[PDB]
Design a binder for this molecule. Structure first.
Ligand code: NA
Length: 279
């Protein structure tokens, strides 16, 4: 059943959302060539627990071995912080940032029983034009989906909007053609991490109607190659592009308002309004 948050729950979700954004703002100066994902995990864990008085959800509730997810390059999602680069057979399982890398840091914070879920891309040193375009177009996908959100809109319009943007990108930029990951989706979020509904990022005809008070994530994963993914069966978590090309993701937790949406995880650096009037 999809939850409609009451005024008290919305305020707690606003606090959780800001805390999750704050972690991403705090960590930025630590993100650079030669730092391990393990170090970033230690700094975030300590900040979340000691400064925010909050909980890292993945470590405590999801059976994740660390506090944050750190996905580099061809890792799509659920990269595991570590101190050393390892291998899944022939596939690199990176842990140490290099010039030219792209990194997603994925933060899920709980404060007073409510969740804030967000992620962003960081560009490490001099990143190629193709990697910049991938990160940029993935963020455009999130931002354009947000512009469609208001009461009465069918859920399928989110993925339909994202796929329309990627189709246009691919028609206009044959050198920088992208695909949408199909295996992972956004989701209702609140008192529980995984609530209804499921939010797919590709073209679909889901007729679920958005209502004021619903809270859910939009988190499109865009691949520089084909859409397919491969799960690390050794560590249970790491998801790779099946073709070894890079992948980028941006996520916000969002509240449906009377006329649009509120971006609970908005960061200070973003040129996106915290409250969109899409009416
Ligand atoms: Na990636």
């Amino acid at each position: 059943s999809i939850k409609i948050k009451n005024a008290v729950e919305i305020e707690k979700m606003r606090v959780a959302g800001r805390l999750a954004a704050e972690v991403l703002e705090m960590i930025e100066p630590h993100v650079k060539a030669g730092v391990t994902t393990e170090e970033l995990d230690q700094i975030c864990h300590k900040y979340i627990t000691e400064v925010q008085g909050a909980i890292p959800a993945p470590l405590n509730y999801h059976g994740f071995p660390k506090s944050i997810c750190t996905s580099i390059n061809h890792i799509v999602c659920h990269g595991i912080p570590a101190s050393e680069d390892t291998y899944f057979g022939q596939i690199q399982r990176p842990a140490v940032l290099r010039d030219g890398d792209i990194l997603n840091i994925d933060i899920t914070v709980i404060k007073d029983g409510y969740h804030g879920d967000t992620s962003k891309m960081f560009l490490i040193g001099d990143v190629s034009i193709e990697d910049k375009r991938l990160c940029h177009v993935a963020q455009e996908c999130l931002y354009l989906a947000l512009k469609q959100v208001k009461p009465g809109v069918q859920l399928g319009e989110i993925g339909t909007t994202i796929e329309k943007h990627i189709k246009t990108n691919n028609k206009n930029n044959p050198r920088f053609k992208f695909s949408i990951v199909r295996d992972y989706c956004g989701h209702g979020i609140g008192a529980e991490f995984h609530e209804e509904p499921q939010v797919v990022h590709y073209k679909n005809s889901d007729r679920t109607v958005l209502r004021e008070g619903m809270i859910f994530t939009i988190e499109p994963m865009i691949n520089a190659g084909k859409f397919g993914c491969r799960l690390d069966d050794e560590d249970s978590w790491t998801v790779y592009t099946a073709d070894g090309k890079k992948s980028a993701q941006w996520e916000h937790t969002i509240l449906v308002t009377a006329t649009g949406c509120e971006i609970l995880t908005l960061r200070s650096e973003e040129s996106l309004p915290r409250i969109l009037n899409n009416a």
